[PDB]
Design an enzyme around this catalytic site. Sequence first.
Site, mmCIF file in Angstrom:
data_model
loop_
_atom_site.group_PDB
_atom_site.id
_atom_site.type_symbol
_atom_site.label_atom_id
_atom_site.label_comp_id
_atom_site.label_asym_id
_atom_site.label_seq_id
_atom_site.Cartn_x
_atom_site.Cartn_y
_atom_site.Cartn_z
ATOM 1 N N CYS B 108 8.836 -6.312 3.883
ATOM 2 C CA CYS B 108 9.102 -6.993 2.622
ATOM 3 C C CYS B 108 10.396 -7.775 2.642
ATOM 4 O O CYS B 108 11.489 -7.210 2.782
ATOM 5 C CB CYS B 108 9.050 -6.021 1.437
ATOM 6 N N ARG B 111 13.234 -7.585 -0.668
ATOM 7 C CA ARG B 111 13.985 -6.332 -0.958
ATOM 8 C C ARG B 111 15.379 -6.426 -1.592
ATOM 9 O O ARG B 111 15.926 -5.402 -2.007
ATOM 10 C CB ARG B 111 14.035 -5.436 0.274
ATOM 11 N N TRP B 280 7.136 -10.994 -7.881
ATOM 12 C CA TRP B 280 6.716 -12.373 -8.035
ATOM 13 C C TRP B 280 6.503 -13.034 -6.642
ATOM 14 O O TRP B 280 6.969 -12.536 -5.608
ATOM 15 C CB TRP B 280 7.737 -13.142 -8.843
ATOM 16 N N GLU B 285 2.941 -17.675 0.172
ATOM 17 C CA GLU B 285 1.816 -16.734 0.075
ATOM 18 C C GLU B 285 0.565 -17.423 -0.464
ATOM 19 O O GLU B 285 -0.526 -17.176 0.048
ATOM 20 C CB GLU B 285 2.145 -15.501 -0.763
HETATM 21 C C1 HEM Z 1 10.249 -9.286 -6.170
HETATM 22 C C2 HEM Z 1 9.523 -10.211 -5.542
HETATM 23 C C3 HEM Z 1 8.873 -9.910 -4.186
HETATM 24 C C4 HEM Z 1 8.714 -10.805 -3.215
HETATM 25 C C5 HEM Z 1 9.143 -12.298 -3.227
HETATM 26 C C6 HEM Z 1 8.074 -10.113 -2.115
HETATM 27 C C7 HEM Z 1 7.692 -10.746 -0.957
HETATM 28 C C8 HEM Z 1 6.810 -10.208 -0.051
HETATM 29 C C9 HEM Z 1 6.046 -10.908 0.957
HETATM 30 C C10 HEM Z 1 6.049 -12.444 1.174
HETATM 31 C C11 HEM Z 1 5.387 -9.973 1.668
HETATM 32 C C12 HEM Z 1 4.410 -10.173 2.850
HETATM 33 C C13 HEM Z 1 3.044 -10.345 2.159
HETATM 34 C C14 HEM Z 1 1.959 -10.844 3.075
HETATM 35 O O1 HEM Z 1 2.258 -11.708 3.935
HETATM 36 O O2 HEM Z 1 0.785 -10.399 2.930
HETATM 37 C C15 HEM Z 1 5.692 -8.676 1.093
HETATM 38 C C16 HEM Z 1 5.245 -7.463 1.565
HETATM 39 C C17 HEM Z 1 5.490 -6.229 1.008
HETATM 40 N N1 HEM Z 1 6.102 -5.961 -0.210
HETATM 41 FE FE1 HEM Z 1 7.309 -7.325 -1.138
HETATM 42 N N2 HEM Z 1 7.808 -8.783 -2.461
HETATM 43 C C18 HEM Z 1 8.322 -8.630 -3.736
HETATM 44 C C19 HEM Z 1 8.281 -7.455 -4.473
HETATM 45 C C20 HEM Z 1 7.863 -6.236 -3.992
HETATM 46 C C21 HEM Z 1 7.765 -5.013 -4.734
HETATM 47 C C22 HEM Z 1 8.136 -4.834 -6.222
HETATM 48 C C23 HEM Z 1 7.323 -4.073 -3.903
HETATM 49 C C24 HEM Z 1 7.059 -2.570 -4.177
HETATM 50 C C25 HEM Z 1 7.859 -1.901 -5.017
HETATM 51 C C26 HEM Z 1 7.099 -4.679 -2.636
HETATM 52 C C27 HEM Z 1 6.636 -3.997 -1.542
HETATM 53 C C28 HEM Z 1 6.122 -4.596 -0.438
HETATM 54 C C29 HEM Z 1 5.524 -3.880 0.658
HETATM 55 C C30 HEM Z 1 5.344 -2.341 0.824
HETATM 56 C C31 HEM Z 1 5.121 -4.978 1.623
HETATM 57 C C32 HEM Z 1 4.451 -4.799 2.996
HETATM 58 C C33 HEM Z 1 3.002 -4.448 2.780
HETATM 59 C C34 HEM Z 1 2.399 -4.235 4.122
HETATM 60 O O3 HEM Z 1 2.929 -3.404 4.961
HETATM 61 O O4 HEM Z 1 1.365 -4.942 4.281
HETATM 62 N N3 HEM Z 1 7.401 -6.018 -2.721
HETATM 63 N N4 HEM Z 1 6.580 -8.862 0.057
HETATM 64 C C1 LIG Z 2 4.579 -6.974 -4.959
HETATM 65 C C2 LIG Z 2 4.303 -8.287 -4.259
HETATM 66 C C3 LIG Z 2 5.214 -9.356 -4.210
HETATM 67 C C4 LIG Z 2 4.861 -10.534 -3.507
HETATM 68 N N1 LIG Z 2 5.687 -11.593 -3.435
HETATM 69 N N2 LIG Z 2 3.665 -10.637 -2.904
HETATM 70 C C5 LIG Z 2 2.757 -9.619 -2.971
HETATM 71 C C6 LIG Z 2 1.374 -9.724 -2.311
HETATM 72 C C7 LIG Z 2 1.533 -9.603 -0.820
HETATM 73 C C8 LIG Z 2 1.370 -8.182 -0.338
HETATM 74 C C9 LIG Z 2 2.384 -7.226 -0.498
HETATM 75 C C10 LIG Z 2 2.151 -5.914 -0.043
HETATM 76 C C11 LIG Z 2 0.919 -5.614 0.594
HETATM 77 C C12 LIG Z 2 -0.058 -6.619 0.734
HETATM 78 C C13 LIG Z 2 -1.392 -6.360 1.426
HETATM 79 C C14 LIG Z 2 -1.331 -7.174 2.741
HETATM 80 C C15 LIG Z 2 -2.506 -7.013 3.691
HETATM 81 C C16 LIG Z 2 -2.755 -5.810 4.373
HETATM 82 C C17 LIG Z 2 -3.850 -5.728 5.245
HETATM 83 C C18 LIG Z 2 -4.141 -4.443 5.983
HETATM 84 N N3 LIG Z 2 -4.663 -6.811 5.428
HETATM 85 C C19 LIG Z 2 -4.438 -7.990 4.784
HETATM 86 N N4 LIG Z 2 -5.257 -9.055 4.991
HETATM 87 C C20 LIG Z 2 -3.357 -8.108 3.910
HETATM 88 N N5 LIG Z 2 0.200 -7.871 0.278
HETATM 89 C C21 LIG Z 2 3.072 -8.432 -3.640
#
Ligand code: HEM
Ligand SMILES: Cc1cc(N)nc(CCc2cccc(CCc3cc(C)nc(N)c3)n2)c1
Lengths: 407, 411
Positions: B108, B111, B280, B285
């Site tokens: 993420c 963070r 947000w 994305e």
């Molecule tokens: C505040 C604005 C946030 C932004 C801009 C952000 C941004 C992102 C982005 C761009 C990704 C990769 C997503 C993808 O490519 O599929 C991601 C993943 C992730 N976000 Fe954040 N996020 C935000 C908030 C949060 C929040 C509130 C949480 C949980 C409390 C969170 C937890 C996670 C987790 C656990 C992942 C990785 C999921 C995985 O392993 O697939 N995010 N975030």
């Molecule tokens: C809170 C939040 C903020 C933000 N800016 N964007 C997201 C959506 C992106 C996201 C955040 C966390 C986990 C996943 C699922 C990603 C995934 C996992 C697997 C196993 N296969 C996929 N195709 C996609 N997606 C969530």
Amino acid sequence: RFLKVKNWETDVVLTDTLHLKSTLETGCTEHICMGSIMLPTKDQLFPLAKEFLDQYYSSIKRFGSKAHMDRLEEVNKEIESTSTYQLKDTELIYGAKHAWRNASRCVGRIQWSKLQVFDARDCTTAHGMFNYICNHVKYATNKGNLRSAITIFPQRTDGKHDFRVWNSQLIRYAGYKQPDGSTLGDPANVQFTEICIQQGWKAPRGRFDVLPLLLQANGNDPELFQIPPELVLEVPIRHPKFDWFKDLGLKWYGLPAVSNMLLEIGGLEFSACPFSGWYMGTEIGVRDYCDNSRYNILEEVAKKMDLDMRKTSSLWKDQALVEINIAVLYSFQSDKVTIVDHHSATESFIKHMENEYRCRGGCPADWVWIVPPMSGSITPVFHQEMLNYRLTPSFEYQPDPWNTHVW
Amino acid sequence: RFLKVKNWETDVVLTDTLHLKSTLETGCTEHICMGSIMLPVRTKDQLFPLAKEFLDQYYSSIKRFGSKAHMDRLEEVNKEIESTSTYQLKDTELIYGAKHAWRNASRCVGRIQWSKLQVFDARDCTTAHGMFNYICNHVKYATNKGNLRSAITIFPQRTDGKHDFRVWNSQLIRYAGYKQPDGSTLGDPANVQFTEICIQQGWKAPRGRFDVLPLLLQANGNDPELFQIPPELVLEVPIRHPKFDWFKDLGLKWYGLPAVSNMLLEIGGLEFSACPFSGWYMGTEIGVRDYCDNSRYNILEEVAKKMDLDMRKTSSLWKDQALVEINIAVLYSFQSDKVTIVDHHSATESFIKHMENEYRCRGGCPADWVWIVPPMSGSITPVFHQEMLNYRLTPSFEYQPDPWNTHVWKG
Ligand code: HEM
Ligand SMILES: Cc1cc(N)nc(CCc2cccc(CCc3cc(C)nc(N)c3)n2)c1
Ligand code: HEM
Ligand SMILES: Cc1cc(N)nc(CCc2cccc(CCc3cc(C)nc(N)c3)n2)c1
Ligand SMILES: C[C@H](O)[C@H](O)[C@H]1CNc2nc(N)[nH]c(=O)c2N1
Ligand SMILES: C[C@H](O)[C@H](O)[C@H]1CNc2nc(N)[nH]c(=O)c2N1
Ligand SMILES: [Zn+2]
């Protein structure tokens, strides 16, 4: 033991068996992944020799034959007597080609088997090194129709007699630190450029000064040579739509030729082994031109396109980036210098992976390096899981020589 | 044991001691790196160490480690485990735990915001209608008429694994996909399977390009139930371009609120299998992945056609050109409608600051480079040149199998 890689775009699943042969270490543990770090005796030598000759004799379908056993005893007898051994030409060519086949960071490996190997093990002086290099440069350049090649100087002995090319690439631009405060030319090469001046180079103090070679033979002190200007093919950079682009004064060289790595074949270490191919466009347009610590030209280009640079969110950096890269590709194509774009190079590598999985049981690949530094997810390698492991023969980094060499 | 990470653009070198507090494995060995693999019922025996370890962290963070209140809480959890085989977290422990799971999320980039998270405690929830109501309130609060606020809603923890709370949706808001007889797809191809399930459960599908999916909600291990989010609660942004007037005629829109609903929250050994969270969007994305993946809306061809790019040779970089204009359009649209969004330059810069602060204050910031680097313009963002160390801290968010694969249907 059997490992799966999925492509998340095409759902294609491949099974890797090749990694069980892995013979060097990754820097990762079960507690920590180091995937994004740039740089993580007679007894030792015979296993390494055996391991390689086994794979060699397997490849010509002669495993366990008379010729196989005979060579193994020959090398065994050579090591016990001389504390090292010499590769046959066939072995040398195979080892070099496999070093490239195993380079996990190289996207261009579909080409691995078309590598011209020049055997320079008879070289004894720096002047000889210069001759061998000029011939390599000219053969590979080929008037713009680039051909892959490597030149192999004598192997390490007691490590007091190493052959080294001090340049990091055969062809690179100088960098000078200015009273002004800024950096003129390529900031990547300040330390080496200073080393050249200190050894005696007359620097012209321009922006695109082709560095002199600094060649070390048989552990001796290195010497300077200028590559004949007529051998260094260069390309002036222009844009197919933006007339003003040429006014930036930008050029790049046609030949990418890494000269600072170490080739390890069957335990033997070839510390000077310059190799060359042809550029993927992004290497110059994204990294060489745009890296903050390189020529760093984004700001300048953006201004000329008259973009709103007030706010990151107009994506002006991204706009300029694409144009800079369009121009690199156009400039090389128009001058008929081989170049490949990131779409075509990554699609080729995907076809290559599939071939390696089916014909070899896998293909080591480092996703961090393979995915191009622009437009990652719209190239097919982005969605491709890759397993990264270390196979020998291989290319390895080695300390820059000015840190090791005693004068 | 200290570990160094270098930035190759700035030469800033950082020292990680935090990886020393790592528990879970990576997938990597000395012999193989798995850093680009997408996806690399507890006994009492295993539970108390995990509880103790969590409560030690917690009491340290409130500067009460080894206090009487600390020892008493350990003993109280001790007994509760020995007697009931599980335990309940205090409100404050839950808040802390949910914040840390985010803080620890190595993939993420967002963070810097980890300490601003609204936690909704839904551990008193018992039914799927209950969940629906909780999720509507989360959606409304988080949306906040476009001024998005991070929030998470936490439903009751796993017990014997036969009574799980699950949100079957992968995100609370997502568009249906419908596979046509001719083999093409209408809407989001990513959601075809889940859409089919929804229809099978009795959803009447409108069958358009952008139909908000119904929520499918399992409470207490019961069969899930369908609920439509009130449309007035679903904030959407129609996509247009600042200079290109034909862009609006592509018909594109997207939802404002990214809310992941399929991950598992692990705190002190406890497993919260339904814990939807939202923040947000980063512009890429939607504009890189949602629109431009070949397996998604796949609009690159149509956009480049309209821009009159040279499409005969990939070396014109027509794809790269269209991709930038699409992403320009996405950010312009959100900003004009006053919906919170962050571009990838700003997000990665912020992440680098967060990361250095984390090294200074916490002795580390675990980070997954493969995921942190944006899927366009990677090397002109400061993360590309940042060495990162990836390791797994608890509390954490984990994946779990899709529930249609595991669920025992009651009928
Ligand atoms: C505040 C604005 C946030 C932004 C801009 C952000 C941004 C992102 C982005 C761009 C990704 C990769 C997503 C993808 O490519 O599929 C991601 C993943 C992730 N976000 Fe954040 N996020 C935000 C908030 C949060 C929040 C509130 C949480 C949980 C409390 C969170 C937890 C996670 C987790 C656990 C992942 C990785 C999921 C995985 O392993 O697939 N995010 N975030
Ligand atoms: C809170 C939040 C903020 C933000 N800016 N964007 C997201 C959506 C992106 C996201 C955040 C966390 C986990 C996943 C699922 C990603 C995934 C996992 C697997 C196993 N296969 C996929 N195709 C996609 N997606 C969530
Ligand atoms: C012929 C076309 C070739 C293409 C298109 C190509 C492409 C690339 C690219 C893009 C990289 C990453 C570069 C960077 O970002 O610094 C790379 C790395 C590498 N290439 Fe290839 N290359 C080619 C030829 C060769 C040849 C002939 C060899 C060796 C014989 C070779 C060996 C390597 C090695 C060892 C690396 C990784 C080096 C490192 O880890 O620093 N390449 N290549
Ligand atoms: C043959 C070849 C073909 C091709 N298309 N491009 C190159 C140049 C790119 C390249 C290929 C292999 C190794 C290196 C050196 C990379 C490096 C090394 C160190 C020590 N620090 C860095 N920052 C970068 N660069 C070489
Ligand atoms: C195979 C590869 O690991 C996979 O495609 C990953 C790569 N990096 C990613 N990075 C982000 N942010 N999101 C993703 O879905 C992916 N996909
Ligand atoms: C920190 C990270 O490992 C480093 O920036 C790498 C990332 N990927 C790269 N990829 C390529 N092809 N070349 C590079 O020099 C780098 N640098
Ligand atoms: Zn790893």
